[PDB]
C-alpha cells in the first residue's frame, strides 16, 4: 500500500507560507536559510542593481522639483554617458564605466540624493553597492555571503525549499508581493502550517511602484486587514516579523523623517511600559518600534476569537543570531500549532 506512511510523513513536515509586502526581504530570509541549514548570475544581477541604481539616481536628479543639480557639473560627459546607456538591456562593464559611476560617486548630489532617494522609487541597499563597485572593478575574489544577502532580485512565482533542521522538516514558499501577483496568493492557502509576515520598517515615507501615491506602511496595514478577517485564514496563527531594523535606526539618527507628521497617531502617543529593551537605546527608537508593534497589534485586537493568534517578534536581515533565536522560537511555536488539533 504505502499510502499511510507517506501520508503520515506528509503530516509530519513543516510547510511555511511567507507572505508579505513588496520587496521586503522574504527572499533574503530564504537565502539566510540556505546559508544556515544547507553560480555565475551573481555578477550579472548585482551589476544590474548597480546600473539600474546609478541611472535611476542620475536620471532622477532633474526629476526632483526641489532643484537637485550636480555639485560637480564638470562630469557632464559622464552624465550624458549615463543618459546614453539609460535604456539598454546589454552592457559589458568596462573599467571606464567604473570611472563613470566612480566619479559620479565622488559628487555630493549623489550623496544627498542618497539621503533623499526615498522621495521616489530607488533601491535601499546601494550604500553597500557603490563602495563594493569602488572595490570590485575586477571580481577575481569571489564575492562573499553578505554579498549574497545584498543581491536584489525581483521575486515572483512560487519557489520552494526543503531543508532539514535537527529532525525537523522544512518545505517553504517564497511568494511575490507585487499587486498583480496577488492573484497567486490563494495558491498557497491550502492548509499550510504557519504564516509569517514581513514589513519593511522604514517604509513610512515611501510608496509602492504601482501608484506612487500612497504609503507602503498603510499598504501593509490594508494587507494585514485583508488577510486578518478572511473566511480562509482563521485557523493559522501568524508570526509577525518587522524587518529592516537598522535602516529605521539610521533614519532615527537622521531625525529628518517623522511618522507623526504623516500619521498623527504617533503625535500624542506615549511609550509602552511593558517593554523589553536593547543595550544603549534611544527612547525614540523604542517608541517607534513599539508604536508600529502596537499599530499591527491594534489590528490584531479586532478579531481572532481565540482561533488565529498574533505573535509579534522582531528581526533584521543582517543578524545570524537573530534568525537563530527567534526562528528557534518559531520552531517551538509551530511545534505547538503543528500539534494543536
Amino acid at each position: 500500500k504505502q499510502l499511510q506512511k507517506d501520508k503520515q510523513v506528509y503530516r509530519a513536515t513543516h510547510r511555511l507560507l511567507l507572505l508579505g509586502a513588496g520587496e521586503s526581504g522574504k527572499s533574503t530570509i530564504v537565502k539566510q536559510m540556505r546559508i544556515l541549514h544547507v553560480k555565475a548570475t551573481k555578477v550579472q544581477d548585482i551589476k544590474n542593481n548597480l546600473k539600474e541604481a546609478i541611472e535611476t539616481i542620475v536620471a532622477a536628479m532633474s526629476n526632483l522639483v526641489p532643484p537637485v543639480e550636480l555639485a560637480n557639473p564638470e562630469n557632464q560627459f559622464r552624465v550624458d554617458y549615463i543618459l546614453s546607456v539609460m535604456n539598454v538591456p546589454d552592457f559589458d562593464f568596462p573599467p571606464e564605466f567604473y570611472e563613470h559611476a566612480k566619479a559620479l560617486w565622488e559628487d555630493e548630489g549623489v550623496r544627498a540624493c542618497y539621503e533623499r532617494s526615498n522621495e521616489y522609487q530607488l533601491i535601499d541597499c546601494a550604500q553597500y553597492f557603490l563602495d563594493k563597485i569602488d572595490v570590485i572593478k575586477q571580481d577575481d575574489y569571489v564575492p562573499s555571503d553578505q554579498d549574497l544577502l545584498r543581491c536584489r532580485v525581483l521575486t515572483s512565482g512560487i519557489f520552494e525549499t526543503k531543508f532539514q533542521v535537527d529532525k525537523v522538516n522544512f518545505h517553504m514558499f517564497d511568494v511575490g508581493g507585487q499587486r498583480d501577483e496577488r492573484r497567486k496568493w490563494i495558491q498557497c492557502f491550502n492548509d499550510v502550517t504557519a504564516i509569517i509576515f514581513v514589513v519593511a520598517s522604514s517604509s513610512y515615507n515611501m510608496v509602492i511602484r504601482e501608484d506612487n501615491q500612497t504609503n507602503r506602511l498603510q499598504e501593509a496595514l490594508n494587507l494585514f486587514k485583508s488577510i486578518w478577517n478572511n473566511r480562509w485564514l482563521r485557523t493559522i496563527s501568524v508570526i509577525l516579523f518587522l524587518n529592516k531594523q537598522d535602516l529605521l535606526a539610521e533614519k532615527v539618527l537622521a531625525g529628518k523623517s517623522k511618522i507623526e507628521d504623516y500619521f498623527p497617531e504617533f503625535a500624542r502617543y506615549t511609550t509602552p511600559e511593558d517593554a523589553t529593551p536593547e543595550p544603549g537605546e534611544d527612547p525614540r527608537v523604542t517608541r517607534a518600534k513599539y508604536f508600529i508593534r502596537d499599530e499591527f497589534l491594534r489590528i490584531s485586537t479586532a478579531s481572532g476569537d481565540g482561533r488565529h493568534y498574533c505573535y509579534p517578534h522582531f528581526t533584521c536581515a543582517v543578524d545570524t543570531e537573530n534568525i537563530r533565536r527567534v526562528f528557534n522560537d518559531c520552531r517551538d511555536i509551530i511545534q505547538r500549532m503543528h500539534l494543536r488539533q
Binding site: 499510502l3 512565482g157 496568493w185 498557497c188 491550502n190 482563521r234
Partner: protein, 841 residues
C-alpha cells in the same frame, strides 16, 4: 401470531427436547435416590417400593430411545402427559400406607413439591392443562393426607406454590416469545441491508468510474464518511498525462429535430446513443457526458493504454459506422464531426450537487476547436496525434479554410416491568407467608417473642419501600419530584442489583425464623409444621431470574442450608437422611434450575442487542443510498422512473437561465503542480452556489448540471400540483430575484478575494421545453428545446455584470413590477433578429 409462533417451537423443538431429556435425567436421579433410601437405610420389611421406580427407569432410558423417533411431532407434549400421569400414579399410589403408629408432612409434601415444579418448569404443558392438573393433584393429594387448624395452612402452602408456579410459567414462555421475535427481525433486516447495499452499489456505479468508487467502497479516509452527512472542502482531482480526447457532434442540428413528439427524438437520438454505448463498451472507452447535440469520450485516464490513440481513432471510425449504418438505417440527411487530441488532462469532480466526473485541460479545448475546425467523414487529428501514430492510415492535410493538423479516413415483558411482578408478587406471597406463620395459632392468639414482630416490622417496611419506590419509578406520575429517583438509582448500578436482590431474597427466611429461638416440640406438630414451613418458603429465591447462578444459587444454599442441618443437631430420632436428602435434591434442583433461567435471560439480552445494531446499519444505508437518488436525478422523474424503465415528458412553459464566469481563463495560470489550487477556489465557489439552493422557498428551483465554468438551472417543473396558491409566473419572478441574489453572492465572493474581481453574465428565457432521460446504466437527466437555445445564444453574447432579458420576458416582468431598458435587436441564429432588453439601468 398463530402459524409463525407455531413454527418457532417447531424449531425450538430440539432445545426443549434437550432440557427435557435432562429432566428425564433428573427423573432417573429421583428413582436413584428412592433406590438408595430404600436400599441401605431402613424399610427392609417390604420391597414394594422399588419396582415402580425401576419401570420408571426403563421409562427414562426407554423414552430416551423414544426421543429420537418420528411418530413424535404431535406426540411429545402428550408424551410429557403420559410421563406425569405415571408420576401421579406413582406418588398417589405410594402415599397412603400410613397412620399406623410415621411419615410426616415433610415426606409427602416434599414429594408434592418436586412433582409440581418438575411439572411447571420443563414438561411444557399448556396453561389450562397443567393448571387444573396441578390443582386437582393438590386437593386430592391433601385429602390423601387426611385419611381446620393446620390443614388451612396446608392449603395456603398449596395455593401459594401454585401462584409462584404460574408466575414462573408465564415469564418462561413470554421470554420464549420475545427471543424468537427479536431473532426473526434480526434475520430479516440483515438480508434487506445486503440487497439495498447492492442498490446503492448500482447508484455509485451509474455516475462514475471504478477507482474513486472503490475509494468510497471501504472507508479508507473517514473524511468521506464525514462528507456524507470549514477551511476547504474535499474533492478528488488528479493531473494525468498522455491521454487522448474524442469529440463528436452533428452538423446542422438546427431544423433537423423540428417535428419530433419528444419521444421520436428520444427514439433515434437514444437509439444512436444506445449504439454509442455498445461501441464504447466494446471498444474499451471512457464516455463522459452529452452536451446537447455533442457526445464525447476520452482514452484511458484511469488506465493509460499502450496503443490508446489507435483505440480512439478506430473507435471514431466506429462512430463513422454509427452514422453510416444508423443514418442509412433511418434514411436521413445528417453528419457528424470528430476531433481528437493527445495531451495531458487534470480530471476529477467539482461541486457537491448533481456532480459528475469531468475533465479539464486546454488540450480539451484544442479538441473543441478541432471540432470547430472540423469537416465531415474523416477524423480531425492534431500534430501531437500524428507525431507517434505508427503512420498505418490515410494521412491528409487538415488545412485552414482561411495549427499543423492532419486528417485520417481509414486503412410487554420488559425487565424492570417484570421486576415489578417478581417483587410485588414476592411480597404478596410473603404477606401470606408471614400471615400463615402467625395464624396457625388458632389454639393460641399471639406469637411469644416481640422480636418476631420486629422482623415483621422492618421486613414489611423494607418490602413496602422497595414496592413504592419501584412502582412510582415505573408508572410515570411526575407530580411532586423525580430527582430522588435519579439520585437514588444513581447509586443503584449493576452490583446493587445483586445486593438489594439479596436483601429482599434473604429476609423472608428470617421471617419464618420468627418462630425459631425458644421451644418448638412440646407439640411436635409445631416442629414438623415449621420444618415444612421453611422448606416451603425456601423455594422463593428463583424469582430474581436476572442475577447470576453461582451467586444466587450459592447464597440460596447458605440461607436455605444453615439452621436446618445445624438445628437438627441440638437436642427427633431418625429423620435426617430423608429430610436433608430431599434438601439435597432441593438444592441441586434450585442450582440447576435458576442457572438455566439466568442463562436464558442473558441470551435474550444478547438477541436484542445485535438486532438493534443491524437496524441502525440499515438506517444509515437507506439515508446514504436514497441521498444519492436525491442527488443524481430529479424528484417526480424519480416518481415516473422509480417503478418503470422509460421517460419522456412534454413541457409548455418554463424558465431557464445561464450564468457565465467571464475571467476564469485569465486567472487560470498553471505554473504550479497542475494549478489545481485554482480548481479548489472554483470548487469553493460552485459549492457556495450549491448552498444557495438549500432554502425552502428556493427549493423550488432545479439545477440542471455544470458545464465547465457555465452554470445552469431551471424551474417550472416542481409545480406538479394544481394548487390554489401558486401563481402561474411566480417561479419566474423569484428566479429573477435569485439571479440578483447570486449576483450579490459573487460580489461577496470577491469581497473575500483580494485585489481581484470575477465578472459574470446571466441570461433568461421562458418557453416550452423537453424533459428527458438518456443513459443506460450510465445516465443523465436532461432538457431540450428551442428555448434553451435562445437563452444559450443570449448569454453567450451577453455583456457582463448584467441581466439579459428576452422581449417576451420583457413583456411579462414589467407587469410583475420590474424596470428595464431597451438595448437593441441582436442577431439570433434561427430567429434572424431578436429584440433585446436589459435589467440594470
Amino acid at each position: 401470531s398463530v402459524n409463525l409462533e407455531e413454527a418457532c417451537m417447531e424449531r425450538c423443538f430440539p432445545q426443549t427436547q434437550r432440557r427435557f431429556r435432562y429432566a428425564l435425567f433428573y427423573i432417573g436421579f429421583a428413582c436413584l435416590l428412592w433406590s438408595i433410601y430404600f436400599g441401605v437405610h431402613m424399610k427392609s420389611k417390604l420391597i414394594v417400593m422399588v419396582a415402580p421406580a425401576l419401570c420408571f427407569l426403563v421409562v427414562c432410558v426407554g423414552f430416551f430411545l423414544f426421543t429420537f423417533t418420528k411418530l413424535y411431532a404431535r406426540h411429545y407434549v402428550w408424551t410429557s402427559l403420559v410421563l406425569t400421569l405415571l408420576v401421579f400414579a406413582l406418588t398417589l399410589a405410594a402415599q397412603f400406607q400410613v397412620l399406623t403408629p410415621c411419615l410426616s408432612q415433610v415426606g409427602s409434601f416434599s414429594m408434592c413439591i418436586e412433582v409440581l415444579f418438575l411439572l411447571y418448569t420443563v414438561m411444557h404443558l399448556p396453561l389450562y392443562l397443567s393448571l387444573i392438573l396441578g390443582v386437582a393433584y393438590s386437593v386430592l393429594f391433601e385429602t390423601f393426607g387426611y385419611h381446620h387448624w393446620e390443614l388451612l395452612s396446608r392449603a395456603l402452602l398449596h395455593l401459594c406454590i401454585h401462584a409462584i408456579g404460574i408466575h414462573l410459567f408465564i415469564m418462561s414462555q413470554v421470554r420464549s416469545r420475545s427471543t424468537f421475535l427479536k431473532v426473526g427481525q434480526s434475520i430479516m433486516h440483515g438480508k434487506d441491508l445486503e440487497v439495498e447495499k447492492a442498490l446503492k452499489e448500482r447508484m455509485i456505479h451509474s455516475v462514475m468510474p471504478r477507482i474513486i468508487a472503490d475509494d468510497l467502497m471501504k472507508q479508507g479516509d473517514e473524511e468521506s464518511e464525514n462528507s456524507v452527512k470549514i477551511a476547504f472542502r474535499p474533492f478528488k482531482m488528479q493531473q494525468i498525462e498522455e491521454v487522448s480526447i474524442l469529440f463528436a457532434d452533428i452538423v446542422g442540428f438546427t431544423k433537423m429535430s423540428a417535428n419530433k413528439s419528444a419521444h421520436a427524438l428520444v427514439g433515434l437520438l437514444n437509439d444512436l446513443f444506445g449504439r454509442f454505448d455498445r461501441l464504447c463498451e466494446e471498444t474499451k472507452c471512457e464516455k463522459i457526458s452529452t452536451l446537447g447535440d455533442c457526445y464525447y469520450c476520452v482514452a484511458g485516464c484511469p488506465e493509460p493504454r499502450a496503443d490508446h490513440a489507435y483505440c480512439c481513432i478506430e473507435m471514431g471510425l466506429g462512430m463513422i459506422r454509427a452514422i453510416e449504418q444508423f443514418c442509412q438505417e433511418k434514411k436521413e440527411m445528417v453528419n457528424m464531426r470528430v476531433g481528437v487530441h493527445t495531451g495531458t488532462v487534470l480530471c476529477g469532480i467539482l461541486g457537491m450537487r448533481r456532480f459528475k466526473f469531468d475533465v479539464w485541460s486546454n488540450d480539451v479545448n484544442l479538441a473543441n476547436l478541432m471540432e470547430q475546425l472540423g469537416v465531415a467523414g474523416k477524423v480531425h487529428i492534431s500534430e501531437a496525434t500524428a507525431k507517434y501514430l505508427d503512420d498505418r492510415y490515410e494521412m491528409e492535410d487538415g488545412k485552414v479554410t482561411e495549427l499543423k493538423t492532419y486528417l485520417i479516413a481509414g486503412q410487554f415483558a420488559s425487565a424492570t416491568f417484570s421486576s415489578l411482578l417478581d417483587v410485588l408478587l414476592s411480597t404478596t406471597v410473603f404477606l401470606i407467608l408471614s400471615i400463615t406463620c402467625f395464624l396457625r395459632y388458632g389454639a393460641a392468639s399471639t406469637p411469644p417473642p416481640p422480636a418476631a414482630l420486629a422482623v415483621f416490622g422492618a421486613a414489611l417496611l423494607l418490602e413496602i419501600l422497595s414496592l413504592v419506590v419501584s412502582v412510582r419509578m415505573v408508572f410515570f406520575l411526575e407530580d411532586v419530584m423525580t430527582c430522588t429517583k435519579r439520585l437514588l438509582e444513581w447509586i443503584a448500578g449493576w452490583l446493587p442489583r445483586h445486593f438489594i436482590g439479596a436483601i429482599l431474597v434473604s429476609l423472608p427466611a428470617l421471617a419464618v425464623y420468627s418462630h425459631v429461638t425458644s421451644e418448638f416440640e412440646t407439640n411436635i406438630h409445631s416442629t414438623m409444621f415449621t420444618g415444612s414451613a421453611v422448606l416451603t418458603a425456601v423455594v422463593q429465591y428463583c424469582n430474581f431470574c436476572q442475577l447470576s447462578s453461582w451467586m444466587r444459587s450459592s447464597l440460596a444454599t447458605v440461607v436455605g442450608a444453615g439452621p436446618l442441618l445445624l438445628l437438627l443437631y441440638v437436642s427427633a430420632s431418625l429423620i435426617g437422611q430423608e429430610v436433608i436428602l430431599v434438601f439435597f435434591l432441593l438444592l441441586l434442583l434450585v442450582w440447576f434450575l435458576n442457572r438455566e433461567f439466568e442463562v436464558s435471560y442473558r441470551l435474550h439480552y444478547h438477541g436484542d442487542v445485535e438486532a438493534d445494531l443491524h437496524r441502525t446499519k440499515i438506517q444509515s444505508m437507506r439515508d446514504q443510498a436514497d441521498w444519492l437518488l436525491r442527488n443524481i436525478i430529479p424528484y417526480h422523474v424519480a416518481e415516473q422512473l422509480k417503478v418503470s424503465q422509460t421517460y419522456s415528458k412534454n413541457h409548455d412553459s418554463g424558465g431557464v437561465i445561464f450564468a457565465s464566469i467571464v475571467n476564469f481563463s485569465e486567472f487560470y495560470e498553471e505554473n504550479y503542480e497542475g494549478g489545481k489550487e485554482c480548481y479548489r477556489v472554483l470548487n469553493e465557489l460552485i459549492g457556495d452556489f450549491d448552498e444557495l439552493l438549500s432554502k425552502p422557498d428556493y427549493s423550488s428551483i432545479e439545477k440542471i448540471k455544470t458545464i465547465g465554468a457555465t452554470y445552469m438551472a431551471a424551474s417550472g417543473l416542481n409545480a406538479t400540483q394544481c394548487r390554489d396558491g401558486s401563481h402561474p409566473q411566480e417561479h419566474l419572478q423569484i428566479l429573477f430575484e435569485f439571479a440578483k441574489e447570486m449576483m450579490r453572492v459573487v460580489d461577496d465572493f470577491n469581497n473575500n478575494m483580494l485585489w481581484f474581481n470575477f465578472k459574470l453574465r446571466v441570461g433568461f428565457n421562458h418557453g416550452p421545453l423537453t424533459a428527458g432521460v438518456i443513459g443506460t446504466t450510465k445516465l443523465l437527466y436532461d432538457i431540450w428545446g428551442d428555448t434553451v437555445n435562445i437563452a444559450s445564444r443570449m448569454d453567450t453574447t451577453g455583456v457582463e455584470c448584467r441581466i439579459q432579458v428576452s422581449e417576451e420576458s420583457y413583456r411579462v416582468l414589467s407587469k410583475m413590477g420590474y424596470e428595464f431598458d431597451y438595448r437593441g435587436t441582436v442577431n439570433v441564429k434561427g430567429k434572424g433578429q431578436m429584440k433585446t432588453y436589459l435589467y440594470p439601468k
